[PDB]
Paper text:
Here, we provide the ligand/enzyme crystal complexes for one such PTP outlier: [name] Plant and Fungi Atypical Dual Specificity Phosphatase 1 ([name]), herein unveiled as a regioselective and efficient phosphatase towards inositol pyrophosphate (PP-InsP) signaling molecules. Although the [name] loop is missing its canonical tripeptide motif, this structural element contributes to catalysis by assisting PP-InsP delivery into the catalytic pocket, for a choreographed exchange with phosphate reaction product. Subsequently, an intramolecular proton donation by PP-InsP substrate is posited to substitute functionally for the absent aspartate/glutamate general-acid. Additionally, we conclude that the hydrolyzed phosphate remains trapped as an enzyme-product complex, until it can be released in a prisoner exchange with another PP-InsP molecule; the latter process is assisted by the [name] loop.
The oxygen atom that is positioned at the apex of the phosphate ion’s tetrahedral geometry points away from α4. This oxygen makes a hydrogen bond with the unprotonated Nδ1 of His155 (we will return to this point below). We denote this orientation of Pi as pose A, i.e., Pi(A). The three other oxygen atoms of this Pi are intensively coordinated by amide groups of P-loop residues Lys151, Arg152 Lys154, His155, and Arg156. The side chains of Arg156 and Cys150/Ser150 also make polar contacts with Pi(A). Deriving such crystals for [name] was initially problematic; we were unable to displace enzyme-associated Pi by soaking crystals of wild type enzyme with 5-InsP7. This observation also speaks to how tightly the enzyme holds on to the Pi product (and see below).
Numbering used by the authors: 49 to 214
Amino acid sequence: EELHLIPPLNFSMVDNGIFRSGFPDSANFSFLQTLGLRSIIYLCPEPYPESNLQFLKSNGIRLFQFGIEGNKEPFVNIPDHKIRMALKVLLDEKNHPVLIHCKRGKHRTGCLVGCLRKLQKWCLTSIFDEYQRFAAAKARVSDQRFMEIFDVSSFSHIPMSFSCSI
């Protein structure tokens, strides 16, 4: 086959040991195996399909599910607590390498990554630009507003010695 690896929908590296994507399917499993994942942070409330559960079991991957309802704008309401819990998992380097995913890798995943960038002291315009690159024509002002007002205070003490940015 030679060119045989298929990263999942909207796949990207976020930082050392942190990846983002939409929902993996079996065509993506050989690529995800190469990343030596310890963790998935899964941001949809739907049960993980059997195919994906077998992949986690076979590969020794822990599933962290913080289900955020997949509403359309303007009827979206990202719960602060779920993002807060997900950031706590993301900030524990023992969980790396970790893949964050939702359905499309644009909205729920975009919000969690944007809140991480706020902890990494990125200016809002740089955070929004990265969010928009993935969300493309489906960029939601509400997701960027969520990142704008998300309170980082509780996380200030946590060292991020894992990051490429020190």
